């Protein structure tokens, strides 16, 4: 299986530096082009740079030339993006992709992407509050409950239920930026009313940028 | 540089329908155009390359065509899992460039929301803030009006909404509205109400609680 | 400024799709007519009715 895995994305101050890596497996980067492509609200999908590891030839987008460099270590089957003199406009998901693989002249495999956030604001871990099921969250014999993941920075967070065993009926809402400059979201799940009190429901929240990992048990509140 | 212009920006169609989206290059790009799909939470995935060739594993209901500098992507029989954004890309000249995307949505029958409300947790109340959450579950279409009232006074400027992308199983939406107050403000008032207006409801629905009631 | 032209696409077999075009009123207009002409190749001759000062269109195809 062909795979590309980006790493290294994180919060960085304006003017700061960051280095991304792109670990390839299931093919040899000496046989293809490797690209960095980013995606942002401001500019959508935007090509950043490419390299042909066999001969080391590189090309750059005008907006990053001089500030970013692409390179590749074929002995580790890995490509890199050095990012200096960073600006708000560089805030984006950074993907790496291959081109020319198996003779296909298009970007046919893309990694999961790594988020780069350029901001002077500081890291803050979320508070996780239960959304307890109640007489006001049930109808038709099913009940809603959830977790409020409030006041964190930067993105990303992840939310799962019962360690990923519970996926049916889950709605995890898009993160919203509060006026405070901190993010917040809720995740809810609908379950049988009869299961409340017998089945354990736990939301697993992880905010890697602050090393915050919380598993919050959500139950009906005692009256 | 070469500009790729995609139309329409949004297209909504029923399951089984034939849909067509377009992409125009600002100058000759030969056949060097690819189409990518991006599903919710996902990375771009290659569908079509060199204008008209299907990438391995892509359903044959996808097809692509070129006419001069005009490119088309056709889905012959729209499926629920085709709900996604679609992007074209030229690789004829450096820099490779992408279109702005076309969002493709699924049409389905009207469904009224299930409406629920959650007081602030006692846990949160230990601190200085209170979040009240109104939940609208599994409705269609997306348009919905949610208003907050506190002791029957309409609230403004102190709530935020968030809406999920279309559900993979039933093509519906869900929405959260969160009212944020200080703990002091929360403890000063009694009745918290969210009123929901939606096409599937015969008249607006109000879900409320009295602070302190179990 | 930027506007959104909303289009109903009404096909000969009664099927209905909806689309939006954005840009200046002039750009979005041109794009909508361009798209109509393209769909006409496969779906038959189109007619476009403009409501809301041109900001909404009903586009029917002959089949």
């Amino acid at each position: 299986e062909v795979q590309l895995v980006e790493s290294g994305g994180g919060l960085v101050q304006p003017g700061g530096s960051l280095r991304l890596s792109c670990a390839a497996s299931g093919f040899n980067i000496k046989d293809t082009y490797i690209h960095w492509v980013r995606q942002s609200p401001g500019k959508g999908l935007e090509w950043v740079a490419r390299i042909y590891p066999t001969n080391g030839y590189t090309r750059y987008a005008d907006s990053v030339k001089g500030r970013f460099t692409i390179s590749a270590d074929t002995s580790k089957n890995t490509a890199y993006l050095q990012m200096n003199s960073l600006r708000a406009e560089d805030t984006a998901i950074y993907y790496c992709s291959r081109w020319g693989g198996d003779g296909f002249y298009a970007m046919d495999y893309w990694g999961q992407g790594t988020l780069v956030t350029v901001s002077s604001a500081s890291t803050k871990g979320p508070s996780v509050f239960p959304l307890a099921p109640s007489s006001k969250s049930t109808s038709g014999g099913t009940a809603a409950l959830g977790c409020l993941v409030k006041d964190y920075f930067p993105e990303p967070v992840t939310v799962s239920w019962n360690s990923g065993a519970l996926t049916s009926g889950v709605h995890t809402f898009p993160a919203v930026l509060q006026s405070s400059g901190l993010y917040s979201l809720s995740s809810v799940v609908t379950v049988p009313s009869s299961s409340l009190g017998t089945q354990t429901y736990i939301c697993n929240v992880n905010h890697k940028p602050s090393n915050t990992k919380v598993d919050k048990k959500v139950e009906p509140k005692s009256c | 540089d070469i500009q790729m212009t995609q139309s329409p920006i949004l297209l909504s169609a029923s399951v089984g329908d034939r849909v067509t989206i377009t992409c125009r290059a600002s100058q000759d790009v030969n056949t060097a155009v690819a189409w990518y799909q991006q599903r919710t939470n996902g990375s771009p995935r290659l569908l079509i390359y060199s204008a008209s060739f299907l990438y391995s594993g892509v359903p044959s209901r996808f097809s692509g065509s070129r006419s001069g500098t005009d490119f088309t992507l056709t889905i012959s029989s729209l499926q629920p899992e085709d709900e996604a954004d679609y992007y074209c890309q030229q690789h004829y000249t450096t820099p490779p460039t992408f279109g702005a995307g076309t969002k493709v949505e699924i049409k389905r029958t009207v469904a009224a929301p299930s409406v629920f409300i959650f007081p602030p947790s006692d846990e949160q109340l230990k601190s200085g803030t209170a979040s009240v959450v109104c939940l609208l579950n599994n409705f269609y279409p997306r348009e919905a009006k949610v208003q907050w009232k506190v002791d029957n006074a309409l609230q403004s400027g102190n709530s935020q909404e968030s809406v999920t992308e279309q559900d993979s199983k039933d093509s519906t939406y869900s929405l959260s509205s969160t009212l944020t107050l200080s703990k002091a403000d929360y403890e000063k008032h009694k009745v918290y109400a969210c009123e929901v207006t939606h096409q599937g409801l015969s008249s607006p629905v109000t879900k409320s609680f009295n602070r302190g009631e179990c | 400024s930027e506007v959104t032209i909303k289009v109903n696409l009404i096909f000969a077999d009664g099927k209905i799709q909806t689309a939006e075009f954005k840009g200046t009123f002039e750009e979005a207009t041109a794009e909508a007519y361009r798209y109509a002409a393209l769909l006409a190749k496969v779906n038959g001759e189109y007619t476009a009715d403009l409501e809301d000062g041109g900001n909404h269109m009903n586009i029917k195809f002959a089949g």
Partner: peptide, 13 residues
């Protein structure tokens, strides 16, 4: 329509 990190989807309107 505008791309949102949280969903990796365009949001219109």
């Amino acid at each position: 329509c505008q791309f949102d990190f949280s969903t990796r989807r365009l949001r219109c309107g």
